[PDB]
């Protein structure tokens, strides 16, 4: 069980840790989050009481270093930082615990929600999508754009998701225009799985990371990526049985975890109606089809 | 994006553009089987690819053989249209290639787009105009070449005959759309109007009769009357 300490909380802010959130008042004596489950990626996220515009946060893995948060009053945000001096860091952490200045990552023993949303997400893959390779942790916010969005402007601060474009020479084999456009199996299985991702696990990691960035930051661009990666599988007549079984599970926990009140902006009516009712896998997503119908029947 | 009355003069400027109409690509007669079920028998079709400035018609004849053992034929018709237009573009020298292709029906937007991915400097545009190009098969000599074709075949026409010698493209196109709109609303009446005077003939190298400017005015008047009559009938008004 690992800990992400805070030097201080100088500004009033709502702190997210994964799917949990805590209000902290301006100059309340708050000094971090303890008992963070080892083994998974985590995100710690922020929305200032005074500007609900700009949600931002940090993907990290406690196995990769000792990380802490410090408020920078120049740049105006909670900053994640690495403490290389390990003995200084244990000394800091042990104090704040003894003084009980730390909220405890509030995991119900039965609750597998985080594992289920981050099952294929690995810090090494997050760091290739979010390039700032002098940190072991990745910064994301609401407004960061995607490589693909820039095509259609600051490269350093882009989300470098795998470009998916159904009307591209990548997607369409010369001489198989109709076959490849109506059945995207060659785009999914040869170009993307064999070609670019290597395996189903890295495909699902990127899909899951895009969803979480959509949900936690309302990143419009991650939303488009999450939907594109779903459509490409649903619009492929030929998908390994295990990918379909795993997709239904991934989508189930993502739909289950979505705030009820955000299904107007985070869910794309057209993509889901196609996936559940029209596409080749219309009958392959029982769990996702059931929760979508019982929780969001309006959208469909 | 789309093409309407607001940007209508665009059609007669000096960017090479083509209209594509796929409404006669896949044509069926519906009949009863011996068992008293229903079956279709396909007949020869055509892609109606037209340059509205010059009147050059690229008439790609679709022989019924292209449908043999194919499923979802009305969806295939769209993709076969896209494929043939792509091929025509690729057979044209660079300075003859169009900068735009306007599809008369929206269901052609994606098929043409996907077939034209190698030509990203060619805009694929829908139109909000309801253009009577379906009536192209009411033109005797186009109907003839399509029904006689024993194989895939591309036949080049000028659908304006020699009109451009005397009138603008704008005016030629209007005359054309008026003749086709008439033919589509009442083929019999329309064609009676065109041939009732035996002294005005169709030149062998032409599609329409050799009318004087005066006789065109009269014909054009008769086609406008026929289009209102039929509309008055359709709508009891």
CATH classification of the domain holding A177: 1.25.40.550
* Of residues A252, A267, A277, the one with CA closest to residue A299: A267
Query: How was this entry determined?
Result: X-ray
One domain, residues B137 and B212:
no
DSSP type of residue B27: E
Q: Do A2 and A64 meet the contact criterion of CB atoms below 8 Å apart? A: no
| Token pair for B169 | 């493209």
> In what helix (H) or strand (E) does residue B62 lie, and over which residues does it extend?
strand B56-62
DSSP type of residue B224: H
Q: Does A186 touch chain B (CB under 8 A)?
A: no
On chain B, the residues whose CB falls within 8 A of the CB of A172 are 114, 117
CATH classification of the domain holding B83: 3.30.420.230
Q: Does A152 touch chain B (CB under 8 A)?
A: no
Q: Do A70 and A81 meet the contact criterion of CB atoms below 8 Å apart? A: yes
One domain, residues A113 and A184:
no
Q: Do A44 and A20 meet the contact criterion of CB atoms below 8 Å apart? A: no
Q: Which residue of A has its CA nearest to B77?
A: A178
- Cα A184 from Cα A191, distance rounded (Å): 10
> In what helix (H) or strand (E) does residue B182 lie, and over which residues does it extend?
helix B169-185
SS3 B12: helix
One domain, residues A137 and A204:
no
Interior angle at CA B191, CA B190 and CA B196, nearest 5: 110
Q: Does A169 touch chain B (CB under 8 A)?
A: yes
Q: Do B133 and B10 meet the contact criterion of CB atoms below 8 Å apart? A: no
- Cα B103 from Cα A275, distance rounded (Å): 28
One domain, residues A48 and A68:
yes
On chain B, the residues whose CB falls within 8 A of the CB of A151 are none
Q: Which of B97, B132, B163 is the last residue of a domain?
A: B163
On chain B, the residues whose CB falls within 8 A of the CB of A169 are 117-118
SS3 B127: strand
- Count of alpha carbons within 13 Å of A172, Cβ hemisphere only? 20
Q: Do B46 and B58 meet the contact criterion of CB atoms below 8 Å apart? A: no
Q: Which residue of A has its CA nearest to B80?
A: A178
Q: Contact B117/A167, CB-based, under 8 Å?
A: yes
One domain, residues B159 and B178:
no
What would the DSSP string read from start to end of chain A? -EEEEBS---S-EEEEETTEEEEE-TT----EEEEEPTTS-EEEEEEETTEEEEEEEEEE-GGG--EEEEEETTTTEEEEEE---HHHHHHHHHHHHHTT-SEE----TT--HHHHHHTT--HHHHHHHS--TTSSSEEEESS--BHHHHH---GGG-B-PPP--SSSTTTS-TT-HHHHHH--HHIIIIIIIIIIISSHHHHHHHHHHHHHHHHHH--HHHHHHHHHHHHHHHT-S---HHHHHHHHHHHHHHHHHS-GGGTTTSS-HHHHHIIIIISTTTTS-HHHHHHHHHH-TTT-
Q: Which of B138, B163, B188 is the last residue of a domain?
A: B163
One domain, residues A123 and A182:
no
Q: Which of A122, A143, A164 is the last residue of a domain?
A: A143
Residues in chain B: 237
- Cα B110 from Cα A166, distance rounded (Å): 10
Residue B69 located in a structural domain:
yes
Residue B3 located in a structural domain:
no
* Of residues A126, A117, A119, A122, the one with CA closest to residue A254: A117
One domain, residues B194 and B94:
no
Q: Do B44 and B144 meet the contact criterion of CB atoms below 8 Å apart? A: no
One domain, residues A138 and A153:
no
Q: Contact B117/A178, CB-based, under 8 Å?
A: no
Taking CB atoms and an 8 Å cut-off, how many pairs form between chains A and B?
A: 23
CATH classification of the domain holding B230: 1.20.80.40
Cα pseudo-dihedral A60, A64, A68, A70, rounded to 10: -70
One domain, residues A197 and A289:
yes
Q: Do B109 and B126 meet the contact criterion of CB atoms below 8 Å apart? A: yes
Q: Do A61 and A41 meet the contact criterion of CB atoms below 8 Å apart? A: yes
One domain, residues A103 and A195:
no
| Token pair for B218 | 């009269």
One domain, residues B144 and B171:
no
One domain, residues A120 and A131:
yes
Q: What are the strands of the beta sheet with A13-17, ordered from one edge?
A: A20-24, A13-17, A42-48, A51-60, A138-141
* Of residues A247, A253, A234, A166, the one with CA closest to residue A203: A247
Q: Contact A172/B117, CB-based, under 8 Å?
A: yes
Residue B130 located in a structural domain:
yes
One domain, residues B37 and B107:
yes
One domain, residues B69 and B81:
yes
One domain, residues A96 and A226:
no
One domain, residues A32 and A162:
no
One domain, residues B62 and B147:
yes
Q: Does A167 touch chain B (CB under 8 A)?
A: yes
Q: Contact B79/A178, CB-based, under 8 Å?
A: yes
Q: Do B194 and B153 meet the contact criterion of CB atoms below 8 Å apart? A: no
On chain A, the residues whose CB falls within 8 A of the CB of B117 are 167-169, 172
Query: What is the tally of structural domains in chain B?
Result: 2
CATH classification of the domain holding A99: 2.60.34.20
Q: Contact B79/A167, CB-based, under 8 Å?
A: no
Q: Contact A177/B76, CB-based, under 8 Å?
A: no
Q: Do A47 and A14 meet the contact criterion of CB atoms below 8 Å apart? A: yes
One domain, residues B131 and B30:
yes
Q: Which domain holds residue B122?
A: 9-163
Q: Do B228 and B220 meet the contact criterion of CB atoms below 8 Å apart? A: no
Q: Which of B85, B114, B115 to mutate to test the interface with A (most CBs of A within 10 A)?
A: B114
DSSP type of residue B179: H
One domain, residues A105 and A176:
no
User: Strand pairing partners for A68?
Assistant: A81
Q: Do A228 and A273 meet the contact criterion of CB atoms below 8 Å apart? A: no
Resolution of the coordinates in A?
2.1
- Cα B123 from Cα B100, distance rounded (Å): 5
Residue B199 located in a structural domain:
yes
Question: Which phi and psi (to 5°) does residue A40 adopt?
Answer: -125, 155
Residue B50 located in a structural domain:
yes
Q: Contact B117/A169, CB-based, under 8 Å?
A: yes
**Residue position matching structure tokens 């009269």:** B218
Q: Which of B163, B188, B206 is the last residue of a domain?
A: B163
- Cα B55 from Cα B47, distance rounded (Å): 15
Q: Which of A99, A122, A143 is the last residue of a domain?
A: A143
Nearest CA to CA, how far is A171 from chain B (Å)?
A: 10
Query: What is the tally of structural domains in chain A?
Result: 2
Residue B4 located in a structural domain:
no
Q: Which domain holds residue A85?
A: 1-143
Q: Do A166 and A87 meet the contact criterion of CB atoms below 8 Å apart? A: no
One domain, residues B74 and B151:
yes
On chain B, the residues whose CB falls within 8 A of the CB of A187 are none
On chain A, the residues whose CB falls within 8 A of the CB of B83 are 177
Between B187-195 and B213-235, two packed helices, what is the crossing angle to 10 degrees? 160
Q: Which residue of A has its CA nearest to B120?
A: A168
Secondary structure (H, E, C), B100-115:
EEEECCHHHHHHHHHH
């Amino acid at each position: 069980m690992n800990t992400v300490p805070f030097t201080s909380a100088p500004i009033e802010v709502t702190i997210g840790i994964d799917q949990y959130s805590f209000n902290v008042k301006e100059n309340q004596p708050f000094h971090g989050i303890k008992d963070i489950p080892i083994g998974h990626v985590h995100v710690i996220h922020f929305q200032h009481a005074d500007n609900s515009s700009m949600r931002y946060g940090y993907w990290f893995d406690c196995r990769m270093g000792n990380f802490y948060i410090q408020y920078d009053p120049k740049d105006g945000l909670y900053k994640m930082m690495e403490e290389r001096d390990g003995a200084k860091f244990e000394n800091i952490v042990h104090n704040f615990k003894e003084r009980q200045m730390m909220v405890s990552y509030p995991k119900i023993d039965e609750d597998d929600t985080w594992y289920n949303l981050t099952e294929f997400v690995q810090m090494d893959k997050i760091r290739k999508i979010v390039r700032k390779d002098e940190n072991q942790f990745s910064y994301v916010d609401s407004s960061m754009t995607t490589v693909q969005e820039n095509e259609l402007s600051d490269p350093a601060h882009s989300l470098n998701y795998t470009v998916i474009n159904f009307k591209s020479r990548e997607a369409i084999r010369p001489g198989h225009e109709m076959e490849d456009f109506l059945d995207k199996s060659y785009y999914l299985n040869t170009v993307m799985l064999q070609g670019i991702f290597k395996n189903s696990s890295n495909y699902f990691g990127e899909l899951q990371f895009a969803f979480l960035n959509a949900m936690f930051f309302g990143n419009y661009g991650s939303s488009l990526q999450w939907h594109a990666m779903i459509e490409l599988i649903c619009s492929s007549a030929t998908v390994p049985k295990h990918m379909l079984d795993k997709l239904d599970e991934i989508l189930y926990y993502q739909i289950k975890t979505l705030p009820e009140q955000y299904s107007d902006i985070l869910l794309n009516e057209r993509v889901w109606n196609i996936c559940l009712y029209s596409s080749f896998q219309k009958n392959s997503l029982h769990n996702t089809e059931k929760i979508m119908e019982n929780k969001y029947p309006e959208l469909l | 994006g789309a093409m309407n009355s607001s940007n209508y003069a665009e059609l007669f400027n000096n960017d090479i553009k083509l209209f594509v109409d796929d409404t006669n690509v896949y044509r069926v007669t519906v009949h009863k089987t011996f068992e008293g079920n229903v079956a279709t028998k396909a007949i020869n079709g055509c892609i109606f690819t037209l340059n509205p400035k010059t009147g050059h018609l690229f008439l790609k004849i679709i022989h019924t053989s292209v449908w043999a053992g194919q499923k979802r034929l009305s969806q295939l018709a769209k993709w076969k249209t896209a494929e043939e237009v792509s091929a025509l573009v690729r057979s044209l020298p660079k300075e003859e290639q169009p900068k735009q292709i306007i599809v008369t029906r929206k269901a052609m937007l994606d098929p043409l787009e996907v077939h034209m991915l190698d030509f990203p400097n060619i805009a694929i545009r829908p139109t909000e105009l309801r253009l009577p190009f379906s009536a192209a098969m009411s033109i005797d000599k186009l109907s003839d070449v399509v029904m006689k074709a024993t194989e895939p075949q591309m036949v080049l026409f000028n659908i304006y005959d020699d009109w451009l010698d005397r009138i603008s493209s704008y005016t030629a196109f209007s005359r054309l759309t008026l003749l086709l709109r008439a033919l589509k609303t009442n083929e019999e009446s329309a064609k009676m109007i065109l041939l009732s005077d035996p002294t005005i003939t169709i030149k062998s190298y032409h599609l329409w009769p050799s009318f004087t400017d005066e006789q065109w005015i009269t014909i054009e008047s008769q086609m406008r009357d026929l289009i209102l009559t039929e509309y008055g009938r359709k709508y009891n008004v």
